[PDB]
């Protein structure tokens, strides 16, 4: 359970950039919702 050693700058920038790329994937969805929130007949967002 206890880690034997530490990680490099290598593997850490890989994992942190996979985390922040996983943050990248959930804003073109927000760009699509922000673009559909604009002028148009949409039956949502009262």
């Amino acid at each position: 359970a206890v880690p034997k050693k530490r990680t490099s700058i290598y593997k850490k920038r890989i994992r942190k950039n996979i985390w922040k790329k996983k943050g990248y994937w959930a804003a073109l969805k927000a760009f699509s919702l922000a673009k559909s929130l604009s002028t148009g007949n949409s039956k949502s967002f009262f």
């Binding site: 039956k43 949502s44 967002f45 009262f46």
Partner: protein, 116 residues
């Protein structure tokens, strides 16, 4: 595994879920338009369609089951004097699940219930 278990259970235990259903459909029948989460929205949709069509046939047995389900006294007797005059010929589909922005603090998918 959940093959074909079509009960929609929330993040609450069973009796607390029943009280959430009864209270939120009660105040849904009080105000008409209401802000819920989407799980709470569909969970209101089934039961409030059951309560619109329950007092559609305004007998005493339907009125007593309907008064037994809903909390408030003076809202069941404001219901069967309103639903045959309004929701006749609709034949199902008494609500609308207009969604909105997520909630600040949870990113909870937040919905909004009509009566149409």
């Amino acid at each position: 595994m959940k093959h074909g278990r079509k009960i929609h259970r929330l993040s609450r235990p069973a009796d607390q879920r029943r009280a959430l259903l009864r209270g939120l459909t009660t105040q849904l029948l009080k105000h008409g338009r209401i802000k819920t989460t989407r799980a709470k929205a569909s969970a209101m949709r089934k039961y409030v369609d059951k309560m619109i069509t329950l007092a559609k046939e305004g007998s005493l047995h339907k009125r007593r089951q309907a008064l037994g389900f809903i909390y408030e006294k003076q809202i069941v007797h404001a219901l069967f004097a309103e639903v045959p005059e309004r929701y006749g010929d609709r034949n199902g589909g008494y609500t609308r699940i207009i969604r909105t922005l997520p909630r600040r603090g949870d990113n909870a998918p937040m919905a909004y219930i009509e009566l149409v």
